[PDB]
Amino acid sequence: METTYALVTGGSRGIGRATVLRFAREGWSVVIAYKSRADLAEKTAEEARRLGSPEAYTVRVDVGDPDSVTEMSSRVGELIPHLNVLVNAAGVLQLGGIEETSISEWEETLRVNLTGVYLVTKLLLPLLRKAKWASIVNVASIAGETGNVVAGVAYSASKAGVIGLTKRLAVQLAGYGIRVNAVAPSFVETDMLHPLKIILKPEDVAEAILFLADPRRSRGITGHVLSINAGRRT
Amino acid sequence: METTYALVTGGSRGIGRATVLRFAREGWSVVIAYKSRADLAEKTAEEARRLGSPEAYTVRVDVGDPDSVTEMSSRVGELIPHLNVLVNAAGVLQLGGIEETSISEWEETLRVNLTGVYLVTKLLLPLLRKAKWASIVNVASIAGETGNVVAGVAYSASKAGVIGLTKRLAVQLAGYGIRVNAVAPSFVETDMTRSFLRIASLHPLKIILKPEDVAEAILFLADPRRSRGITGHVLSINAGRRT
Ligand SMILES: NC(=O)C1=CN([C@@H]2O[C@H](COP(=O)(O)OP(=O)(O)OC[C@H]3O[C@@H](n4cnc5c(N)ncnc54)[C@H](OP(=O)(O)O)[C@@H]3O)[C@@H](O)[C@H]2O)C=CC1
Ligand SMILES: NC(=O)C1=CN([C@@H]2O[C@H](COP(=O)(O)OP(=O)(O)OC[C@H]3O[C@@H](n4cnc5c(N)ncnc54)[C@H](OP(=O)(O)O)[C@@H]3O)[C@@H](O)[C@H]2O)C=CC1
Secondary structure, eight states, rough: OOEEEEEETTTTHHHOOOOOHHHTTTEEEEEESSSSSHHHHHHHHHHHHHHHHHHEEEEETTTTTTHHHOOOHHHHHHOOOOOEEEEEEOOOOOOOOOTOHHHHHHHHHHHIIIIIIHHHHHHHHHHHHHHHSSEEEOOOOOEEEEEEEESSSHHHHHHHHHHHHHHHHHHHHHGGGGEEEEEEEEEOOOOOOOOOOOOOOOOHHHHHHHHHHHHHHHHHHSSSSEEESSOOOO | OOOEEHHHHESSHHHHHHHHEEEEEOOOEEEEEEEEOOOHHHHHHHHHHHTTTTTTEEEOOOOOOOHHHHHHHHHHHHHHOOEEEEEEEEOOOOOOOOTSSSHHHHHHHHHIIIIHHHHHHHHHHHHHSSSEEEEEEEOGGGGTTTTSSOOHHHHHHHHHHHHHHHHHHHHGGGGGTTTEEEEOOOOOOSGGGGOOOTTTTTSSSSOOOHHHHHHHHHHHHHHHHHTTTTSSSSEEESSSSSO
């Protein structure tokens, strides 16, 4: 088989970083996409190489900016022959009701959390179509599933939008054999109410992302939202 | 004791228009918010008054533009004392897969269908809070509930966003006693004639969904006498295409 290549936005922290390292343990080559923490990205790359990635690259990108994403895309195309897995995990949190959410805050949240997913996926599709097999995993949130959670109105709207995008892309891209799924975690403990007495960690979400990314495990699953909330919402 | 006032965006055509007229039959005063066809909006206002609206007003607004919405809310505040019902039905269609959907096409779709609902609701909240009872009904789409439909990627994302927004506002605004729900219709006979010489065979119930069928669901969700205990719900109208 061909070498496996995975790209993870928000790959230098939280869920994205945990996902990159989980992929490395699988022997998958990785591309760590980050906005500004070049230091954290390179240190993540060094751990990925130690853990098992044949190759680990870093690439700077602002997912909410079209030009930045277009450049990242070209840059990535110069480093790898194809892309098997794309994980969009570069979302940003937002809090507050509609009265306290200013128009600029609303727009910025949608630009990064929703438009960013569409942009990264759009520009990297040619690389994904070149792979013998491919999958896409978007990191949504329980906030996109329900209003009964403390999250800003823009955050909830953007995450629900990510879920809608995930489902439509799954059906539309199924023709190319590309699977598209999402994970919807509840509160996750990072460097920033439920029946099961545990605290979700980035590594817990990474396991779920790996399951959905790997065709050996989920080849028949597409357009699904895998909820990880320790039972807060069934 | 107080007159019922309802505002409907996209009120001069399709679902919005049918809703305005159904509201008029209920004896509610209506504000017809429209984007460009001032002539059709006035015709709607006339028909509303004839049907039962004590008062019928028209207001121009581009829900995708902050200045336009802000100006619209100011004008509305000069015409009515409060607002009991808000219906956001000013959405636009978008077709195409991700490769076929240009960045600008995506942005404009989100701007109108999702950000527009947020804008209108945000600028009119003061008037809604002034009323003794209030409810918001957003028009989503089956496209926001499932990927198994023919609709563009941006359209599906924006409508799913509308549903997420609806749910969160329902929980957040419950404190003010304001209910927020959504209707999610599938194919509806409207100025989307593109699909006409099959669609009626897309569902178990062999019927043809009309704007007035959606208007009935919107009325149910808007009227507290009918749905006082319902909030944050998405009422699907698809003749069984999706259960
Ligand atoms: N924590 C939670 O409770 C939950 C989180 N999520 C989702 O997890 C995903 C990541 O969250 P989390 O891991 O906490 O986030 P972090 O706060 O750890 O950082 C988020 C990532 O966003 C990255 N980022 C932001 N913009 C870009 C960009 N434009 N390009 C590349 N990276 C970008 C940051 O990179 P840098 O700063 O270096 O640019 C950072 O690694 C998001 O989709 C989030 O919404 C979902 C549900 C729950
Ligand atoms: N038809 C279908 O199959 C389905 C439709 N829907 C939804 O129904 C809602 C309306 O669709 P439909 O009734 O067919 O649309 P129409 O094509 O009949 O017209 C849509 C309305 O959009 C109005 N409009 C667009 N922008 C604005 C604006 N900025 N301010 C005020 N009005 C605006 C137009 O008014 P003017 O041109 O006068 O400015 C028009 O009345 C949308 O949310 C749509 O997505 C949902 C599911 C299915």
